Every structure is written in C-alpha cells, then in structure tokens.
C-alpha cells in the first residue's frame, strides 16, 4: 500500500519516484582502486551500457577515521579499513576531473561523502544530490551538515532500526530538502535470505513522504528486480567494466551486460507493477465474448413444461439471452414453446 | 501485508503457500495440437527441465459449447473457438495415457475442465487438484460441481471483479476444500502494462484464507518473478518443448531454458522476499564495528576546558567510549586532562 504514492523529486533533470522510470545508480565506489585511468574506463563502460547516473565515494581518510581504523579489518578484505581507503581514495584534483568526465558523457555525477571534509569538497564541486551510506545513516552531525547544502539526499538505511532512521529523517525535513530511503543490507555479498524486501514497505509506512528504493550487495539482479515489483524507485548496485578487476566490491558489482539486463527488467516491472484488480482491460473484451457461458437447454423441453436445474445447463459462448449469472433465475419459468436440446435459452422461450 | 500469511494446502505430496517453495505449473494446455505423441515430447521436455506439475486442458467440445461457438473467433487465432478445440482436444483414452505418462515421470498431473463432462472425466481419473480457468471463474454451476469432488481448487480470476469472485469463493468454502486464487489477465500475449501485479494484494485482502498466485500470458518471466517478490505461491505459464511449434499459445509459452530461469529466480525471490526492516542480521556485525562513528577531539583541549560542538567531532570506527549517538551529551563536560586532537574521547577524559 504505502509504496504506491506520488512522491517525487529531481536529481538535476531526472525525476525520481514511483510514477517515474526507476533509476539505476551505478556505484563505481572504490572499484577504480585509486586509479583515475581505471575510473575513466569504468565511466565509459557505464555510459556505453546506457547508465544515467554514476556514483562515487569521497574519501578524505584523515577526517573520516581516527587511528583506531588502522587496527580494524572489514568482513570482505584482509587489511585495515584505513589501508583500503588510503590506497583507493582519489584526491580532490582527480575527483573534480572524474565529475567533469562523467558529465562530459551526459551522465549525472553524485557521490557519497564519508566525512565532513568529503561533504565540503562535494559542496564546492556543486553536486546535484548526495548519497549517505549505511555507515553514516546514524551519523547525525554529518547528516546535519549535508542537509544544510540544500540538495536532495538519498539515504541508505542498513544496520539501523526504524527508530534510529527517524532521527536522521527529522534532520532532513527540518532542512527542507526532499529525500529517498534505500533499504539495504551491508554484507558483502548478501545472501538472498538476508535481503528482506519487505523492509521497503516498513520504511514507506514509517516515512510516507519518502521516495523508496533498494541498495544491494547480492551476486545478481533478482533482489533489485523484486524491489522494482514492490514499488522501488531507485536501485543501487556497485558497477565495474569487467568482473576480472581486483577489489573488495567487485564480486557483487554489475557489469555492462548485467546492468542492461537490470535496466530492461526494471522497465518491464515498472509497467507491470501496481494497479488494481477490478480495472477493466479493454483488451480482454474479445476473450470474455467467447469464454463466458450462456444458459442452454440440457434436454428437449415441451411447450408448457417448467424450466429447472434438470433441463437447463450452461455452455460457451457468452452471446446468449441469459448469462450463467442468471441460471437460477430461470428455475420455474414456463416454456413458451418447444425448446430444442442444446439451444441457448432465448427471451422469447419463456412466458 | 495480506500476502504474507501461513495459508497452505497440499497437491498430492507437494505443499503450496507463502511459507513453501513457489510452485510453477507448466501448462501444456492445447499446445500438443491434439497429438498424443507431441504431448509426450512436451512432458519429457518438462520433466527434464525439472518441472513438478504438468497441467492439461480437458475439452469435450459438445458439453463445452453450443453451436454459437462455431461463429466466434478468439483474439489470437483466425478460425472459430469450436474448430480450435475440436482439432486440439484429446479423447478420454489419450488423456488417461497422458496422465499415466506424467505420473510415470514422477510429476503431478492436474487439468482444467472446461465443461461438466470434462469435470466428471477428471473425477473418474482421480486427479489431485483442479484448475478452473478465468473463463469459468464466473461459471457458478461448474464451480459447484467441481467443488463437490473434494479436491483443492486453483481458481484463475481474470475478467472478473472482486465481487464476482466472491460468489465463486463462497461455493468453494461451503464445499470445505482449500483453494488458491491466481491473478490473471487473458490477453494473448499480455502487454506488461496490463499485468497489474497489485491485483494479487487486492485478492489477498478480500480473501484472507486464499493461497495467492499469478497465471501469466506475457512474453517472458518478469511478471512471474515480480509475483514471487510480492508473495505469490503458484506461478502458471503455458509450456512448450520448443518455440518453433505451431499453436495459438506457443508465443507466450516458456520452454525448458526459460522454465529453468524462472525456477531459479523464483527460488532467489522466495528467500529474499518479506521479512522486517528491524530484524538484526548477525552478518552485519563486522560492518557496524568499523562503519559507525565515535566521538573524537576536533582540537587540542586543555585540562579544565569545556567540551563543545567546536572542539569535538565524530569519526570511524565504532569502538570509542562515546558513540556518535551520544555526541551532544558531551557538550559542557569538562576535560579531566589534556585531550589530544584526533583522539577518541574516553570516559576517563571527562570529569
Ligand atoms: Mn555499497
Ligand atoms: Mn492460459
């Protein structure tokens, strides 16, 4: 019920929401492994596959983490999160050229700031919307900062309860910018059984002004396609130009072929989803005309004999004077003439 | 909400319902073009692709239609419905051998009776459940007959309003047999835009004891996969051993490859669908440990100085004494010692 709404906002010229074509965000993320060259190759692959939006991650490691980060290992790598972010991070000059390049290909560039300095770098660049990752969903100070920039926010909600998300959404509303909530599970990769697509409806019922989507880290497109069937408006998967690239997120990334598959499925499900059972489909009319049943004589019935459940039955097609709906209303009427076995009962056959 | 239920029943040894693996019904239908040989080839192809259930149509043309049927043409052929059914119908001997053959391959055989004589033929054969097609959804006399057989009913609901379906469901309940409702659109093939998957939820809210599914006549699997994401339990598509066969339903039929695709997608979506947003996923724990932020000093703070929003900030990872959740609670506390810029605030750092 709640995901079928008219909520919408714009990311540059692209309208997003239930009544619009679903938007697939290609998250290049840290997939370029810190090489501007590789990022360009991945942008090209995304452009050529028909992508509309390319999303980056903005890492300024010194403002993003304290020295404790050098001693903690993520679940999908074997060195510290600090080492990974330091190796992968693009400096400001390079991130500016990356945005310029994505925009040169007619695509929208957005990014996820992981820190205050990251957020301020992106505001200087003037990006059209901000993604907040699940890690920062409960980082209320960072959300305050980002919301003050006056751009729409796409908030990922993994690792956070409805009540925790509420505090983030209050800050966003107070700032007066529109937002989307992406349901998300941050296990790299995500087992099918942990996706819980019903979480999207949980989010929509709690936050009726939110545009709703899915960010996904499973091995394929099924989860995202399911999210589109349920009403999702934004789909996010990591993206790579090819699956033999190194990096911790490559495994759950889409490539050009699987992007195109998702785009086509998303289009199909956008059209198929929603609507109402009772809507009359013009195209069904011919089928109804032959497939519905009319009342027929099940026996020779003499003039003056009573019609009954023993001498009446129903058969296709639907053009007889009495529809199967009216079968029992004929019980006890009297034959106005001889009625031939197998003939449709006519209005002139009854007194 | 309503499709997530514990409703179930058995078709022979196969349990069907939201809490069970979705069931794909391979409708051979009239695809054999009246040849027992061809039907066997299609059964073999279904068995080898991993099908669980093969569904037939039982046509006894004389009890199914009056002479008017020889003058009406369906929307996906160019001769009368009578001519098509007469050419395609298997006689009783052949239908008995077809059931025997499907059961010899360890599969379940069910059928759709299109008439009273068809229904009685199938009762003599002792099929384990009955499908009622959309045409007969409102054929209340036929539904009464079929329900009296004491087997579960799978009812297709195309071309019929919730109110019309109600009358059919009342008859089924009175008979005391369990049932499923399949949402359906009878246009061959169905445009994506006419599918209206939300009709499944309309059916579940109106009929809370019903097992719910989709019968589909689109050109591919997207609709069915969407139905599984929403909670659907039974999927029905026409089936052929190959796509170069003649016949009016071949166009929208699945073949062995597309059956297997649907089976795998259905399995994936069965696992992914439903659930709750607030459920704590054990597998997310490592990510939370590195991705959440702790309060840090944003400046050198001398012993005795007050903590504030100017000399405090937040940074990854999440192992500090104060979580980002507690950031503002530190405002106005007094430094118990020199606090180093960038260090996590500890409990021993405050008076
Ligand atoms: Mn991600
Ligand atoms: Mn059909």
XYZ file of C-alpha atoms and ligand atoms in Angstrom, chain B residues 27 29 55 57 114 131 133-134 156 184-186 188 215-217 236-238 249 252, ligand 2:
22
model
C 0.552 -25.642 -18.728
C -2.767 -26.854 -22.473
C -1.262 -29.075 -16.402
C -6.894 -28.760 -20.545
C -13.949 -26.569 -19.441
C -7.663 -25.759 -12.058
C -9.698 -21.155 -15.900
C -10.643 -17.464 -15.992
C -7.909 -18.154 -12.102
C -4.593 -13.258 -14.353
C -5.075 -11.172 -17.485
C -6.442 -13.060 -20.542
C -2.640 -13.467 -25.563
C -1.233 -17.033 -14.105
C 0.556 -15.260 -16.883
C 0.425 -14.762 -20.606
C 1.436 -20.636 -14.157
C 2.732 -20.227 -17.686
C 1.998 -22.193 -20.830
C -0.492 -20.198 -27.105
C 3.581 -16.749 -24.622
Mn -3.718 -19.582 -20.128
